[PDB]
Amino acid sequence: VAFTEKQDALVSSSFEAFKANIPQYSVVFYTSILEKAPAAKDLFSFLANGVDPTNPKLTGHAEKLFALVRDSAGQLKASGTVVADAALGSVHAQKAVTDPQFVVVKEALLKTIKAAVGDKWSDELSRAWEVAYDELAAAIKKA
Ligand code: HEM
């Protein structure tokens, strides 16, 4: 999987824009997911009492999630291949991680990066994140 230097640079950068406001951007992410995925509210431990930007568990999970996708970009740029930890592979093996759900989370992710970058959005940017997310979603299912 071809992933260039430039594409890696687009994602490290826009990720930084995401790090500027985790509570606010992590609201866009979750709201999107709960909007299109019925099982979501019951699956996440922290989604119990809704989307709460003050819950560090919610905000911390979103940070974890996006760092891993930025990390997927760095692995692809370096080797052309991404691997997911076995533990991360099993947390998902339960079920609701149906394949359609993966697409719902990708959609939430791009929409979040879009809210974060503002006027810096371009198709190049979306594309850099889509690949890194897809490669990591494929690694997760199989590792
Ligand atoms: C490729 C994108 C994905 C990444 C990078 C990812 C990453 C993560 C991480 C970092 C954790 C575990 C942290 C921990 O051990 O507590 C986690 C937990 C979880 N994820 Fe994913 N995830 C992905 C997609 C999804 C999708 C498609 C679903 C389905 C709705 C999902 C469902 C869950 C559930 C229910 C948990 C447990 C929540 C908790 O920490 O209590 N994730 N995810």
Of 54, 68, 81, the C-alpha closest to 109 is: 68
The C-alpha atoms of residue 124 and residue 101 are separated, in whole angstroms, by 24
Assigned token pair, 36: 């299109």
| CATH-assigned architecture of domain 1-143 | Orthogonal Bundle (1.10)
- Say what the resolution is, in angstroms: 2.2
User: Is 141 among the annotated ligand-binding positions?
Assistant: no
- For residue 141, the CA-to-ligand 1 centroid distance in Å is 12
Contacts of residue 41, Cβ cutoff 8 Å, sequence gap at least 6? 34, 47
Assigned token pair, 47: 């989604």
Cβ neighbours, 10 Å, residue 133:
23
The C-alpha atoms of residue 102 and residue 31 are separated, in whole angstroms, by 15
What method was applied to determine this entry? X-ray
Give nearest CA residue, ligand 1 atom 43. 65
Do 69 and 129 form a contact (C-beta atoms < 8 A)? yes
Q: Which residues line ligand 1 (CB under 6 A)?
A: 37, 40, 43-45, 61, 64-65, 68-69, 88, 91-92, 96-97, 101-102, 105, 133, 136-137, 140
